[PDB]
Design a protein that fits this description.
By secondary structure, this protein is α+β, with helices and mostly antiparallel strands. It folds into two domains: 84 residues, Phosphorylase Kinase, domain 1 (2-Layer Sandwich); 172 residues, Transferase(Phosphotransferase) domain 1 (Transferase(Phosphotransferase), domain 1), CATH 1.10.510. It has eight helices and seven strands; from the N terminus they run βββαββααββααααα. The protein has a five-stranded antiparallel sheet. Strands 6-7 form a two-stranded antiparallel sheet. A hairpin with a 6-residue loop joins strand 4 and strand 5. Helix 5 runs antiparallel to helix 7. The termini are far apart. The structure holds the ligand CC(C)(C)n1[nH+]c(-c2ccc(Cl)cc2)c2c(N)ncnc21. The site of the ligand CC(C)(C)n1[nH+]c(-c2ccc(Cl)cc2)c2c(N)ncnc21 has 16 residues, from strand 1, strand 3 and strand 5.
Length: 256
């Protein structure tokens, strides 16, 4: 439709990350606009399911969600062209020297921005399924935007993140907006700790056992009670008893 553009009009300058699925490049749309280019390495999938991500983005357009600009799907290397996010993924950023020197003020803001984009997705009636700091991107103005809608659904190459996935989603395959709320609470842990792996020292297997036994991550050092209460809320066993992303955005804006 109005998303196909001729290869010509895209210049790939510098590589930003290799996957076992493709590359991400910083580039230019006809010299004027800085863009990111998601490369598909052929044979890996699914020159379609690679595009499922882009197809989903055509519908999901909010300011705190990475914006699609265009696609190139006619020659053998397929591209997804999006808004370029200068500071990379939220995970990477929080771990960098610069990220290590941002105080809670901005961390809570990061957190609340993500809660905002998620409040759009709930409203829109979608689920992300793969919500975590590595799937949040940061621009120059320190804006957080949600990316990677590979697993996003309206109700395969895939691999949902065990340590981020709600217990009823693991055990009964039950993915809902409320399961995303669980994932968000884990993303709060990620933010607070400056990009530490959840459940340090535990394998996916362990975690999960331990979840079936009512285990929660104990309150972490350098995390205020009120914040941990928000985390604890997102982890309520009963999915129905977890907050909405609107309540999260409200409660998060109220730290001052
Ligand atoms: C992995 C990393 C951090 C280098 N990365 N990944 C993407 C990205 C590109 C296209 C889509 Cl469809 C989704 C995400 C990205 C981006 N846009 N801007 C800056 N860094 C990006």
């Amino acid at each position: 439709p109005a998303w196909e553009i001729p290869r010509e009009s895209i210049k790939l300058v510098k590589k930003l990350g290799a996957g076992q699925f493709g590359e991400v490049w910083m580039g230019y749309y006809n010299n004027s606009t800085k863009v990111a280019v998601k490369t598909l390495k052929p044979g890996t999938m699914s020159v379609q399911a690679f595009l499922e991500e882009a197809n989903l983005m055509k519908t999901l357009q909010h300011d705190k969600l990475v914006r699609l600009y265009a696609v190139v799907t006619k020659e053998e290397p397929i591209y997804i062209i999006t808004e370029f996010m200068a500071k990379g993924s939220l995970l990477d950023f929080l771990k960098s020297d610069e990220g290590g020197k941002v105080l809670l003020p901005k961390l809570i803001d990061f957190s609340a921005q993500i809660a905002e984009g998620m409040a759009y997705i709930e409203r829109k009636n979608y689920i992300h399924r793969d919500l975590r700091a590595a799937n949040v991107l940061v621009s120059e103005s320190l804006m957080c935007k949600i990316a990677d809608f590979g697993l996003a659904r309206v109700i395969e190459g895939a691999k949902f993140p065990i340590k981020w996935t709600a217990p009823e989603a693991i055990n009964f395959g039950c993915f809902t907006i409320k399961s995303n709320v669980w994932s968000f609470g884990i993303l709060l842990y990620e933010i607070v700790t400056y990009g530490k792996i959840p459940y340090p020292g535990r394998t996916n297997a362990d975690v999960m056992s331990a979840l079936s036994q009512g285990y929660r991550m104990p309150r972490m050092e350098n995390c205020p009670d009120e914040l941990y209460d928000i985390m604890k809320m997102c982890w309520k066993e009963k999915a129905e008893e977890r907050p909405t992303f609107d309540y999260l955005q409200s409660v998060l804006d109220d730290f001052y």
